[PDB]
Amino acid sequence: EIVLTQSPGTLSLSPGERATLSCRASQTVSSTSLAWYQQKPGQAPRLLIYGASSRATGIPDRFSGSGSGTDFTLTISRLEPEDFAVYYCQQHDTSLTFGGGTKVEI
Amino acid sequence: QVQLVQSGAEVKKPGASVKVSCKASGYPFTSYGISWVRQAPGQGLEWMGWISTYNGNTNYAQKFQGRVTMTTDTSTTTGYMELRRLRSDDTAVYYCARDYTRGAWFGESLIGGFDNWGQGTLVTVS
Amino acid sequence: NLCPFGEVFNATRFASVYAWNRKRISNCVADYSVLYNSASFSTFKCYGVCPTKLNDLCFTNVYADSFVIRGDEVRQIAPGQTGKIADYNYKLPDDFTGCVIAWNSNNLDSKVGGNYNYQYRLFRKSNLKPFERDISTEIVEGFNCYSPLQSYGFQPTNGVGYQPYRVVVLSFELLHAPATVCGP
Ligand SMILES: *[C@@H]1O[C@H](CO)[C@@H](O)[C@H](O)[C@H]1NC(C)=O
């Protein structure tokens, strides 16, 4: 299985500011097998980006991402009051695993 | 639209088993697989396994091998997961989701992720 | 029960041309409008059948073949055509009744320096028959001795004719039997 590590652990950012979240794999992961999720407190996880460049239906166009090799990134062009949540990177190139997750807070 | 509905919270003794249902509608049941992921308090998302609604084939995480059984009922378009030999470390919220990471018919790897997650079922072991 | 077209088109990995993959679709409802009206395809030409009438037709079997080739090789996936792909990798017959669908995969099937995982057959004693597959590895290399398979130069910076394309061929079979696949 492939280990996914996200960084930084916790982000401290104001509303209106831009945020970038990184995920690094211990092994090469194809873009076709890399996805990102968002989880709000008290709610189930939601799929934001699948395939590392394509967003799920219902997801705002301020959410995007890209990557290759072992380095993938999720970018939020502007943080809204509703964008403060825990984000996860996930791969299913080998079995299926999730990263530790990264928290973005005000 | 698509919605997955699970059962309410359950309390079980150590060594007991728990069966969690997931009723799914708003889409062709046999066209998409069902995935199960659990989240213990303060923890991240841990994958348990995957089942196809077309041919009944399963794929489990090694960590849960021998303890988890999955089945489906097409006539009621409802999935089920049973976790056996409950331990104090199995206290978590168990979620179902609509899968598109593995093919339902051939089992090929697809470009997609887990969506239409249920509300989650809390299981306490004590 | 709907036919697993998405399972074929939205796959993460395609087979190389010399060793093309095949899957059989049967006992399901085939909605072809999801392919016909898709903007993701660069090629969608049907032979012997109109692409807008497919939903009104029933077949006993639908066969889906898939492989990766270069842009300038896409024209050889057709009846009456010849060339290194048409003759030594994937041959279609003169009276084909099916549809050939292809799209650019430069952002999936290439990497910096070139993706040489996919290879194509270069040498063969004779030409292939329709729907024949040959994955033999018979030639030690040396003077007048060559490896049968040649790697592709799929670099992300190549011109369009040298970029990788994902090709899916849907063959329509009608037997002296009740149909198993019909449209809506
Ligand atoms: C492939 O997936 C996309 C969504 O990423 C979907 O819109 C498209 O219809 C799918 N293709 C087929 C043939 O189902």
Numbering used by the authors:
A (entry chain B): 1 to 106
B (entry chain A): 1 to 126
C (entry chain R): 334 to 472, 483 to 527
Provide the authors' original text about this structure.
Kimura et al., Wang et al., and Acevedo et al. showed that Lambda exhibited reduced neutralization sensitivity to antibodies induced by both vaccination and prior infection, with evidence suggesting that these effects were caused by the L452Q, F490S, and RSYLTPGD246-253N mutations. Kimura et al. and Acevedo et al. also considered other variants, including Gamma, and found that Lambda exhibited the least neutralization sensitivity among all those studied, and Kimura et al. found that Lambda was more infectious than the other variants due to its T76I and L452Q mutations.
Local classification and refinement of the RBD bound to S309 improved the local resolution of this region, permitting atomic model building in the cryoEM density, including the L452Q mutation and the main chain of F490S. Both mutations at positions L452 and F490 are associated with escape from site Ib RBD-targeted antibodies. ELISA experiments confirmed that Lambda escapes three of a panel of 12 RBD-targeting antibodies. Yeast-display experiments showed that the F490S mutation does not improve binding to ACE2, while the L452Q mutation hardly has an effect on ACE2 binding.
